């Protein structure tokens, strides 16, 4: 599902459609263009992931002036549909936004939606254009605004770089800040409540709350029509996500068995851990093995899709891209789960042990969560959706994450040299994951890629590098090659990334 | 209202979109692209004129696998919904076709529409593609077929020449023959093969035998019913009062039925002519008699010379009798779109040729030859007369209606014995004049009854000399231009559309 909205375009629309047919890998089944009546300059375009209804440029009979296109999914449409007695003409849940927009405006329609979305709304009655995204950064949105009044919104930045505006030579294609709603006036030519839970912060009665929130998040994420698969990396996060996923699937009476996917190098502890978790839970495990040649040949397309030039979200996105391609090739599991967003929410990184104080620990956790739409969610989203797959994060929801971050700073920090202590303790007695893998906190792929970079980039151009790439100069020979590929693909658009990756 | 289908493609679908926008002037209000699910190679496209309801690529709930895209209006839709007890999810006129296609196949969905229609239908369940056009041809449809399974259908040929197909050097864009429906097999990769193309040529929804004083009553009833049924329109209706008898009667009957139906807006006529021309005076006389809103348009020579290029680009023909009368129609249509808010025009085009209405028809060797010539020239109406009346009108977002070409009236007129249609007392179209003599629809002075081509000839002579005409025999091998005017029109047409001259075969005047 990919959206593309244009407003104020003056260089026709036939020559400006080539950008739209570049995010088409998000949904390869359907495709639709539209023009806002009376606003021929404005145009809409959608790509759908697979029979009759589902075309995103919604224009209902009750609200003829509301044109909404959203490339996400909201998990709380049933509750408000029953509670607010709202009738939906179509089968798409996103219409509820319209049924809320006429109710209390944009603040009420954006702040009462459980799920991940990125929506563009046009209201000709009051002549207003609204743009919206999620609290954390999933379902990416990118906007380009020329001073004259040009508006260009695309799910991925590949649909705006090729856009041509003759008014000004350069258009600034910037990522949309995650938690924000933008309201603009259409000329003729922060919001980061949606709601069992035991009050108090006692240690015994906090595990119940955490488990309830995690189970509710997983059950809410079950809302789909395609198959559900899980990426079984091997760590604690994805292991518990898969365990709870299959438990709810058995509870929900789902015919197809759960399908876990694990990408790894030959004879690695991570792959063995994934196999062990799959064997204990009892799912269908697919053990993808990747070599150096495929990972090297995928660097160009990984950089093209991820739209980044870092050294941490392009060194782990290769495996995710390969496993997504394998899933699309030899599996019908469209909807995919992932444990991403769980090792910074509860301070799971290696460098969180060297913490000057717990206050700085949760401050850094919040800072990392705010900048999650460029480091971790980007890798798990662009690579996944480049193969016609839909990502779901069972850990990064609005309620469980807020409760975890609202907890006392003393509980989140590791206490016995083992990270994620509270998460490990909460589900220890549930027997969801074997004690060998739930406990025991924590492959030669970086070295071979570095040796490839040494044979690709030279040594003299390394010293005289920080004038070819002035902003965010690369340091190592690997980041320089990533930046070179990014510049060859997207020229001069290096302002998307501000800082590479700063562990303390 | 412009349709566009691209069944079969290999050169992406975004570099092949400019052709779709090349015909966007038909309706400049909306424009939708669509890709058929499971057949991402084939793509649709519409350009609608004049709110929420519309978007002609219909996909009804009851027929999820049927995708229809049509240009035109089906006038007998209120007599089919009740009779065939067929519902309608959308307020679109053409949806009825889909229902009929599920009732009696394609033959029963084509020989039951008493209107004008050029439609593309796709049925992915049986993997079939259907094309179609009117019996007479007042709806434009052009098809481009490549053997590898490429079927590109556009309302005007300006939306097919730009289309690019690799693995094939030349793409043949040809007009679709009216009265034909082309069943096509859809291979499971987007390619299209041809299986059938057969002619098809509805009265179930006061008709005595043949005799004088009775045939006139039948003609009166048929013409009145045709105009009344053609009144179905959600926007303003304004007749083109050229000054001739056909347009005069059309406008008079239109005003009578509008007054009968209690329409708030007053009928407005529209005439274009040179200074103090007798045709303009006759049009003013008719407008004064019937009590209408006449907006005469005076067009100068320079405007015609400037609009020659645009009229050749739009009319898509290089005749000497078509782009010589389409200049005035184009200018008047521009005037109507600019300084008036009438979008539906009930022109009298397609009348004289139906009822023996030309100067040479006087010297007919025999009545049988006269009626055969009338039928032949009326069958070829999609290149000479209707083309000028339709392309020029639609180039400014205006719709065309031709009440004289309705199936019932024309069929009855041509079923008449030949000795009644023939000129009788040295006049043209005697029976039509007598059929409305006592109705007082049009005054007796005009019912009972040129310095434009000289500037064109002199401008062509100044532009094109005899040096080019000394080699025009080999410069244009197919349908060589004889006169200088034809030479200049052909040169402009070839500059606009290169090497596509198979559209026209003959010009005029079969003495």
3-state secondary structure of A496: coil
- Distance separating alpha carbons of residues A89 and A55, to the nearest angstrom: 13
- Distance separating alpha carbons of residues A193 and A108, to the nearest angstrom: 9
Return the active site residues of B. 1
Phi/psi of residue B293, nearest 5 degrees? -110, 100
Residues of chain A whose beta carbon is less than 8 angstroms from a beta carbon of chain B are 12-15, 17-18, 20-21, 28-35, 37-38, 40, 45, 50-52, 59, 61, 64
- Distance separating alpha carbons of residues B508 and A358, to the nearest angstrom: 95
CB B297 within 8 A of CB B332: yes
CB B237 within 8 A of CB B293: no
CA distance readout (Å), A93 to A68, A105, B169? 12, 18, 47
- Distance separating alpha carbons of residues B35 and B244, to the nearest angstrom: 47
Known binding residue A472? Answer is: no
For A49, the closest chain B residue by CA position comes to: B37
Q: Residue A336 pairs with which residues in a beta bridge?
A: A229, A391
Q: What is the DSSP string of B440-465?
A: TSS-HHHHT---SHHHHHHHHHHHS-
CA distance readout (Å), A201 to A208, A211, A214, A264, B203? 11, 14, 17, 40, 83
Sign of CA dihedral B382, B384, B389, B392: positive
- Distance separating alpha carbons of residues B31 and B48, to the nearest angstrom: 6
Which residue from A18, A31, A37 is facing B33, i.e. has the nearest CB?
A31
- Distance separating alpha carbons of residues A423 and A342, to the nearest angstrom: 10
Q: Taking CB atoms and an 8 Å limit, are B40 and A28 in contact across chains?
A: yes
Examine the residue annotation and report whether A12 is marked as an active-site residue of this protein: no
Q: Taking CB atoms and an 8 Å limit, are A21 and B14 in contact across chains?
A: yes
Q: Where are the beta strands (DSSP E) in B18-156?
A: 32-35, 43-47, 66-73, 116-123, 128-130, 142-146, 150-154
CB B350 within 8 A of CB B385: yes
Which residue from B13, B35, B64 is facing A52, i.e. has the nearest CB?
B64
Chain B partners of A50 at a C-beta cutoff of 8 Å? Answer: 37
3-state secondary structure of A430: coil
- Distance separating alpha carbons of residues A448 and A454, to the nearest angstrom: 10
What angle, 0 to 180 degrees and rounded to 10, lies between the N-to-C axes of helices A236-251 and A269-281? 20
Task: Kindly list the structural domains of chain A, giving each domain's residue range(s) and its CATH number in brackets, ordered by start.
Answer: 2-185 (3.60.20.10), 204-446 (3.40.50.620)
Sign of CA dihedral B94, B96, B101, B104: negative
- Strands of the A128-132 sheet, one edge to the other: A66-70, A119-123, A128-132, A181-185
């Amino acid at each position: 599902c990919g959206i593309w909205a244009l407003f104020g375009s003056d260089d026709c629309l036939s020559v400006q459609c080539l950008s739209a047919m570049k995010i088409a890998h998000r949904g390869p089944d359907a495709f639709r263009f539209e023009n806002v009546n009376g606003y021929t300059n404005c145009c809409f375009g959608f790509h759908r992931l697979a029979p009759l209804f589902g075309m995103q440029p919604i224009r209902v009979k009750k609200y003829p002036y509301l044109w909404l296109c959203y490339n996400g999914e909201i998990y709380n449409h049933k509750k408000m549909q029953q509670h607010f007695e709202f009738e939906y003409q179509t089968k798409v849940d996103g219409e509820i936004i319209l049924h809320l927009y006429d109710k209390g405006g944009i603040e009420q329609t954006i702040c009462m939606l459980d799920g991940v979305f990125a929506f563009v709304l046009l209201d000709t009655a009051n002549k207003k254009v609204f743009l919206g995204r999620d609290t954390y950064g999933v379902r990416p949105l990118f906007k380009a605004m020329t001073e004259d009044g040009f508006l260009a919104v695309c799910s991925e930045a590949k649909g705006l770089v090729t856009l041509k505006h003759s008014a000004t030579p350069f258009l600034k294609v910037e990522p949309f800040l995650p938690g924000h709603y933008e309201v603009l006036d259409l000329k003729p030519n922060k919001y980061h409540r949606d709601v069992k839970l035991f009050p108090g912060f006692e240690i015994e009665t906090v595990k119940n709350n955490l488990r309830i929130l995690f189970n509710n998040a997983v059950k809410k994420r079950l809302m789909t029509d395609r198959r559900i698969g899980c990426l079984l990396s091997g760590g604690l996060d994805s292991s518990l996500v898969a365990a709870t996923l299959l438990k709810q699937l058995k509870e929900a009476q789902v015919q197809y068995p759960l399908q876990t996917f694990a990408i790894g190098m030959e004879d690695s502890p991570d792959l063995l851990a994934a196999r062990k978790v799959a064997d204990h839970i009892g799912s269908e495990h697919y053990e993808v093995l990747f070599n150096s040649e495929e990972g090297i040949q995928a660097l160009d397309e990984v950089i093209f899709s991820l739209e980044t030039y870092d050294i941490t979200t392009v060194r782990a996105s290769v495996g995710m891209y390969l496993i997504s391609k394998y899933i699309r090739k030899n599996t019908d599991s469209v909807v995919i789960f992932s444990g991403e967003g769980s090792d910074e929410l509860t301070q799971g990184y290696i460098y969180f042990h060297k913490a000057p104080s717990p206050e700085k620990a949760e401050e850094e956790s919040e800072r990392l969560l705010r900048e999650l739409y460029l480091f971790d969610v980007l890798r798990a989203d662009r690579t996944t959706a480049a193969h016609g797959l839909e990502l779901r994060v069972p850990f990064l929801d609005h309620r469980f994450s807020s409760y975890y971050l609202s907890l006392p700073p003393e509980m989140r920090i590791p206490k016995n040299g083992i990270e994620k202590h509270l998460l490990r303790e909460t589900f220890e007695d549930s027997n969801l994951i074997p004690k060998e893998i739930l406990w025991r906190p924590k492959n030669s792929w970086f070295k071979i890629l570095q040796e490839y970079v040494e044979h690709q980039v030279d040594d003299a151009m390394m010293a005289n590098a920080a004038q070819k790439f002035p902003f965010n100069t690369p340091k190592t020979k690997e980041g320089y090659y990533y930046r070179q590929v990014f510049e060859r693909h997207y020229p001069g658009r290096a302002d998307w990334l501000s800082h590479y990756w700063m562990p303390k």
